[PDB]
Design a protein around this ligand. Structure first.
Ligand SMILES: O=[N+]([O-])c1ccc(OP(=O)(O)O)cc1
Length: 573
């Protein structure tokens, strides 16, 4: 029913912005989705300025005012074999490939103006690199996913998922390399930034709260940072999205709890629109950050006014399809409380058609943040339930690590409960499961382990077999999988939908990017083979020249359109 396409394509098309830093003297560096693809722009108060030629994937963090931007573009048609390109800001649209770096999964990076420090992954290692005038140097080989946080002088700070789901903090030297890894018996570090005193300020997420610590690298000492203003310290945040020093020394922090964040400057809370904020930068004296919300696509506003600098306005009608939204606390199987964001659709009755949309990750969370899938779903006439199952971020360390070694176990029990809640609360008249990635893994775990729960399910870029996916993984994922599963082949086998297909009883729609190197297509072709033989009902959509990263309005459409079509079809019985 085309009345569906009109809105879904519109929600997809709305320009989306993310903030990166201040470059070229004093212009904001931003990444926005606009024109039908992901590009990098300079903004200076008026018209925006495209920096790259063809679509990119992202930009490396630039120090304040540097005169160049390092683009990160996939040169593998989706497989995510990134190549790094340099662009001088005075000469927009001219790129010089950094041929010193061979294509790899570029995980993160910063550009000091003189040196380029990033972390990449290959079939054999995740490493911390540095590319300056003398060429490429590997500063350290890392255990698993590691991301660069900040560079001040020779001191490099980063975050690393080096074991058991915990995030550790590491330091290295830009000229002499090396690696130090600081662990915190109390939890995981969520952000880092180097202080003028050359100590590492970091967010620390413990079982309960999230606190500000100072970590002296010279040894490893940790102590609570004391801020000038006490506002911050009296809010008790659950997580710290990002923190960092502005040019003038003031400490900027973005803390969050229950799905919404606040921004503090030296401990003094600055007013910011409700929702969630990205990094904070000092621009011409003023404070800029990125704002988002279930009803507001990622935009860039001024603080404290909230006035928008760059923003893809969301239309009135489409804005009107989200009748409301709540944060609920679904009662799980073990007595656990699953924070769940719900979205009543203005186009469905109550009770009515509901979709338990499962977030990916698993270390992610459903928060007060723009979500294209849930929005279009509301648009198509379905209420949306988004449960922060155990393994989610944003609710403490204890809740986040409960998934380690237990995939397709407890979190799945939390997803089922969200359904149980949707039905018993009066919101649902019928139930569907839909998700991309770990979310799509969950659809597959729900349909197999728990037939009868949902009327049908949509699994996009889904996990299908830990064993095979493993042997097809680069150093970052293989390690990441070794962490989720605990490494036991009993878990990898027993917690793989591919092995319990006989149990399926509902209609399945498989959507998968042909070149996805995060969740490979190969196992999904075996699944389809299994579905066929067992005489199971299913439809599938494999997408051309695309990977896990959806960075063009055509791939987003090819991925969301089939989904909404599938569900609208099941809804009419
Ligand atoms: O291999 N893995 O363990 C694995 C691969 C892809 C995943 O999905 P993502 O979280 O959305 O990047 C999650 C886990």
């Amino acid at each position: 029913f085309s009345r569906i396409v009109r809105d879904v394509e519109r929600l997809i098309a709305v320009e989306k912005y993310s903030l990166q830093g201040v470059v070229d003297g004093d212009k904001l560096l931003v990444v926005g989705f606009s024109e039908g693809s992901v590009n990098a722009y300079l903004y200076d108060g008026g018209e925006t300025v495209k920096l790259n030629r063809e679509p990119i994937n992202s930009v490396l963090d630039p120090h304040y005012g540097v005169g160049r931007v390092i683009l990160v573009r996939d040169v593998s048609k989706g497989a995510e074999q990134h190549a790094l390109f340099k662009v001088n800001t005075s000469r927009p649209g001219e790129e010089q490939r950094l041929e010193a770096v061979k294509p790899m999964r570029i995980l993160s990076g910063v550009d000091t103006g003189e040196a380029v420090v990033f972390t990449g992954a290959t079939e054999d290692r995740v490493a911390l690199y540095a590319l300056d005038g003398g060429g490429l140097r590997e500063l350290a080989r890392l255990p698993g996913f590691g991301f660069v946080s900040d560079i001040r002088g020779d001191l490099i700070a980063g975050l690393g998922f080096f074991g058991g789901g915990r995030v550790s903090l590491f330091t290295s030297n830009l000229s002499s390399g090396g690696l130090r890894v600081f662990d915190s018996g109390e939890g995981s570090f969520s952000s880092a930034s180097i202080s003028p005193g050359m100590k590492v300020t970091a967010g620390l997420e413990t079982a309960r709260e999230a606190r500000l610590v100072t970590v002296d690298p010279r040894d490893g000492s940790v102590e609570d940072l004391e801020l000038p203003s006490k506002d911050f310290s009296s809010y008790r945040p659950t997580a710290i999205t990002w923190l960092g020093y502005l040019p003038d020394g003031r400490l900027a922090v973005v803390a969050r709890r229950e799905g919404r964040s606040a921004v503090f400057i030296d401990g003094e809370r600055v007013e910011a629109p409700q929702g969630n904020h990205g990094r904070v930068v000092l621009w011409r004296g003023k404070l800029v950050t990125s704002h988002t919300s279930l009803s507001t696509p990622p935009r860039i506003v001024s603080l404290p006014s909230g006035e928008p600098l760059l923003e893809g306005g969301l239309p009135e009608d489409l804005r009107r399809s989200i009748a409301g939204s709540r944060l609920v606390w679904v009662e799980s199987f073990d007595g656990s409380r699953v924070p769940t964001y719900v979205l009543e659709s203005g186009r469905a009755p109550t009770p009515g058609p509901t979709v338990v949309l499962v977030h990916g990750g698993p270390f992610a969370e459903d928060s007060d943040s723009w979500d294209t899938f849930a929005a279009s779903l509301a648009a198509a006439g379905f209420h949306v339930v988004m449960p922060n199952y155990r393994g989610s971020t944003g609710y403490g360390e204890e809740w986040r690590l409960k998934i380690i070694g237990d995939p397709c176990g407890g979190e799945l029990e939390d997803v089922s409960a969200a359904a149980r809640w949707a039905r018993e609360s009066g919101l649902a008249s019928e139930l569907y499961i839909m998700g991309y990635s770990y979310g799509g893994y969950m659809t597959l775990c729900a349909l197999t382990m728990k037939p009868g729960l949902f009327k049908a399910g949509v699994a996009g870029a889904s996990v299908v077999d830990w064993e095979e996916m493993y042997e097809l993984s680069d150093a970052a994922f293989r390690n990441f999988i070794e962490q989720l599963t605990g490494g036991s082949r009993e878990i990898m086998r027993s917690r793989s939908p591919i092995n319990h297909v006989d149990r399926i009883k509902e209609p399945l729609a498989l959507i998968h990017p042909q070149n996805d190197s995060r969740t490979p297509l190969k196992p999904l072709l075996r699944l389809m083979g299994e579905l066929l033989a067992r005489g199971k009902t299913f439809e599938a959509h494999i997408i051309p020249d695309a990977g896990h990263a959806i960075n063009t309005m055509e791939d987003a459409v090819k991925i969301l359109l089939p989904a909404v079509f599938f569900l609208a079809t099941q809804r009419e019985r």
